[PDB]
Enzyme design. Structure first.
Site, PDB file in Angstrom:
ATOM      1  N   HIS A  64       1.568   4.379  -2.959  1.00 33.24           N
ATOM      2  CA  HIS A  64       1.669   5.816  -2.799  1.00 33.24           C
ATOM      3  C   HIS A  64       3.028   6.306  -3.309  1.00 33.24           C
ATOM      4  CE1 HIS A  64      -1.992   6.478  -0.479  1.00 33.24           C
ATOM      5  NE2 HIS A  64      -1.570   5.790   0.555  1.00 33.24           N
TER       6      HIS A  64
ATOM      7  N   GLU B 204      -6.092   8.153  -1.185  1.00 33.96           N
ATOM      8  CA  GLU B 204      -6.267   6.874  -0.474  1.00 33.96           C
ATOM      9  C   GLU B 204      -7.266   5.935  -1.186  1.00 33.96           C
ATOM     10  OE1 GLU B 204      -3.539   7.548   2.652  1.00 33.96           O
ATOM     11  OE2 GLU B 204      -4.507   5.743   1.755  1.00 33.96           O
TER      12      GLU B 204
ATOM     13  N   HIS C  60       0.808  -1.211   0.000  1.00 32.44           N
ATOM     14  CA  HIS C  60       0.000   0.000   0.000  1.00 32.44           C
ATOM     15  C   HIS C  60       0.853   1.278   0.000  1.00 32.44           C
ATOM     16  CE1 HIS C  60      -3.629   2.452   1.512  1.00 32.44           C
ATOM     17  NE2 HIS C  60      -2.631   3.238   1.902  1.00 32.44           N
ATOM     18  N   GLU C  61       1.827   1.333   0.894  1.00 29.44           N
ATOM     19  CA  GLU C  61       2.713   2.490   0.919  1.00 29.44           C
ATOM     20  C   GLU C  61       3.585   2.612  -0.337  1.00 29.44           C
ATOM     21  OE1 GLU C  61       2.105   4.853   2.900  1.00 29.44           O
ATOM     22  OE2 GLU C  61       0.725   3.624   4.075  1.00 29.44           O
TER      23      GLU C  61
HETATM   24 ZN   LIG Z   1      -2.612   5.191   2.246  1.00 33.51          ZN
END
Ligand SMILES: [Zn+2]
Length: 425
Positions: A227, A262, A223-224
């Site tokens: 980003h 997000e 997930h990171e």
């Molecule tokens: Zn996030």
């Protein structure tokens, strides 16, 4: 082929190349920290992050309030050599778990290719590096050399469970939103994970559930990394663009606002809360940024520094941005190619898609309520593997996500804090 060639130990002697004391150039004054280069363009610093933010330079717990209500403090975490060794081994293992999947290989390849743009020149005819996209590495002679890099994994700051991909700002430029990109520092720990609830009506209710299932930390790191991919390609959505959530009555009671960045990153149904008109606006905006990068490239006729040739660096960026090159040598952005790369970075690389490759149980939406934080140790292969995570094959943990079931696999999880009911809804 493994992502990380070397199985580093924290106490391995420094060599000034891939094991080195380093400084982060505009963290401001800091003592050098020991760091490990696990792959081209990617370093790991097994320290708590008291460096990236001047106002977040100490780890002590107390009462600025208990806000965010979801938070966890322990000033001593990651202060010892054994912890740092385990941190380095855990992070490595998660990179290997990610890389073992086709999706993770794709994402990590995009990250390595995503060199922050050389947009630092005040002179259009010269191409120059932006020096906050580097670290300073102590060489064997004690002197520093500047090394460009794309990604650093570092320990969390005071709030242990506040993971985030962050980066140094620029006086003039929004590097993460102007197509340029910038070196990303991901605050992350492999030593804790989150609980969630298997029934949607429970997981999305702030008053119910204790966190029976544990999130696989590979998903959390992925997930990171997603980003970081957005931010390295300079296509992150300003956090000001928010879904003023109106699909969960408890979110609404507290006016909870969730960034489009997000929702994008989670993917699945969540991404559909960004309406088609606004998706198109973002796509246009970023396409325009890539155009400006092509124009900037074309205007440059000399390179600054002795590290690389100007042709080498033009090719680097033509490969990063998938630019077209005309007979005269002019760069241009091909609309089909832009849409395909944009879509790869934003729709293919999503948390929901990683869950499918890892075959794990996971939250079904970002729009839920956190339940608990657990202490874990994924370093022992008896606990967690690259290929199976917690759901070890040929054990009682192989079926039904039993390895992620914190009641069944209780030895692998120590609950540190409950979040249910702490919420103001
Ligand atoms: Zn996030």
């Amino acid at each position: 082929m493994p992502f990380v060639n070397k199985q580093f130990n924290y106490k391995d002697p420094v060599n000034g190349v891939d094991i080195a004391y380093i400084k982060i150039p505009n963290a401001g004054q800091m003592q050098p920290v020991k760091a490990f280069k696990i792959h081209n363009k990617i370093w790991v610093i097994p320290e708590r992050d008291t460096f990236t933010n001047p106002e977040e330079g100490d780890l002590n717990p107390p009462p600025e309030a208990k806000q965010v209500p979801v938070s966890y403090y322990d000033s001593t975490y990651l202060s010892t050599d054994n912890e740092k060794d385990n941190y380095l081994k855990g992070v490595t293992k998660l990179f290997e778990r990610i890389y073992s999947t086709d999706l993770g290989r794709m994402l990590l390849t995009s990250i390595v290719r995503g060199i922050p743009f050389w947009g630092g020149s005040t002179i259009d005819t010269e191409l120059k590096v932006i020096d906050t996209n580097s670290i300073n590495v102590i060489q064997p002679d004690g002197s520093y050399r500047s090394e460009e890099l794309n990604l650093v994994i570092i320990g969390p700051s005071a709030d242990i469970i506040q993971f985030e991909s962050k980066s140094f700002g620029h006086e003039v430029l929004n590097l993460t939103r102007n197509g340029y990109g910038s070196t990303q520092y991901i605050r992350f720990s492999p030593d804790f994970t989150f609980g969630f609830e298997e029934s949607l009506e429970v997981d999305t209710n702030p008053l119910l559930g204790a966190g029976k299932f544990a999130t696989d930390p590979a998903v959390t790191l992925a997930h990171e990394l997603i980003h970081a991919g957005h931010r390295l390609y300079g296509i992150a959505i300003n956090p000001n663009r928010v879904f003023k959530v109106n699909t969960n009555a408890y979110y609404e009671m507290s006016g909870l606002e969730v960034s489009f960045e997000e929702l994008r990153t989670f993917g699945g149904h969540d991404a559909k809360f960004i309406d088609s008109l606004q998706e198109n606006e973002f796509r246009l905006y970023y396409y325009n940024k890539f155009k400006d990068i092509a124009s900037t490239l074309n205007k440059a006729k000399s390179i600054v520094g002795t590290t690389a040739s100007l042709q080498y660096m033009k090719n680097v960026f033509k490969e990063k941005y998938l630019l077209s090159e005309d007979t005269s040598g002019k760069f241009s952005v091909d609309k089909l190619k832009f849409d395909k790369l944009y879509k790869m970075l934003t729709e293919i690389y999503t948390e929901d898609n990683f869950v499918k490759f890892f075959k794990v149980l996971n939250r079904k939406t970002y729009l839920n309520f956190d339940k608990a934080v657990f202490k874990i140790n994924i370093v022992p292969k008896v606990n967690y593997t690259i290929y199976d995570g917690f759901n070890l094959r040929n054990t009682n943990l192989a079926a039904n996500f039993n390895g992620q079931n914190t009641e069944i696999n209780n030895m692998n999880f120590t609950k540190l804090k409950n979040f249910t009911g702490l919420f103001e809804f």
